[PDB]
Design a protein around this ligand. Sequence first.
Ligand SMILES: Cc1nc(Nc2ncc(C(=O)Nc3c(C)cccc3Cl)s2)cc(N2CCN(CCO)CC2)n1
Length: 278
Amino acid sequence: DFPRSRLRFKEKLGEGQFGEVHLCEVDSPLLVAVKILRPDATKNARNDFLKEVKIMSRLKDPNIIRLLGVCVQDDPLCMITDYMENGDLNQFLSAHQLEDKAGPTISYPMLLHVAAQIASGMRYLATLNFVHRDLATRNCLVGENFTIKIADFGRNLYAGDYYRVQGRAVLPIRWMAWECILMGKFTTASDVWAFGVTLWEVLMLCRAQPFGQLTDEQVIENAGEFFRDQGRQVYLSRPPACPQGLYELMLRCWSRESEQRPPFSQLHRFLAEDALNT
Ligand SMILES: Cc1nc(Nc2ncc(C(=O)Nc3c(C)cccc3Cl)s2)cc(N2CCN(CCO)CC2)n1
């Protein structure tokens, strides 16, 4: 149980619904991320905080954010993770351009490595029957040497990625499989569908929102068209950097039937091995 006395708050990194995240130095320089309660925290927030600790303490994988420590015994409450020095993957990738064979660059096999790491992380969450429910580049963190960690969740930079109706759950409908949109059904199989969208983002180098020229309402109609199965449904197009082989893998992630979507083990295998084929 970590002593908050050895923490030195340096920068504010972001706000959540019940917490804010700061950069801190640890005198024992060593940089960590510390999430604390927001200044307006009600006791509903406190509970959701203590519950996040419970949930997060499960998570032990190289490509999942890890809980390094807690100050929970006495206030103030805090959560400690590694500090991912390169911020979220959406931001990060947006700052790069695909490497030119003939601004900062990144290579196609590096895009695969980034995607593979997300897959390996999700392969891990699958073994825990843990359903993420909001997998997207914006919720992936980036450390040194293109290391990726999936975050447990989460705030205004990406407001347009969520569909909001008063009294309803805030929903990332553009990353959601049709059965989630239509039936509220969230499974590892729909995490697989959102991974296909996330892989699409990575290949787009986050240059465009999924279905970015369709309205929310049309995205929701598109879901119903997967359901009615009369071939009218539409898909994300193949990104410029994406070979047809990788794209068909993407399309498998958007099979109407949950069963026909690839498992993450296979997604990993492909990204780390097959994808390197000419
Ligand atoms: C929002 C943001 N976070 C960054 N790194 C983080 N590492 C871990 C984070 C985190 O929240 N851990 C966590 C905790 C502690 C509790 C519960 C759950 C979790 Cl997941 S956040 C870096 C960053 N950068 C902005 C840009 N900068 C210049 C480049 O322009 C570089 C830095 N911005």
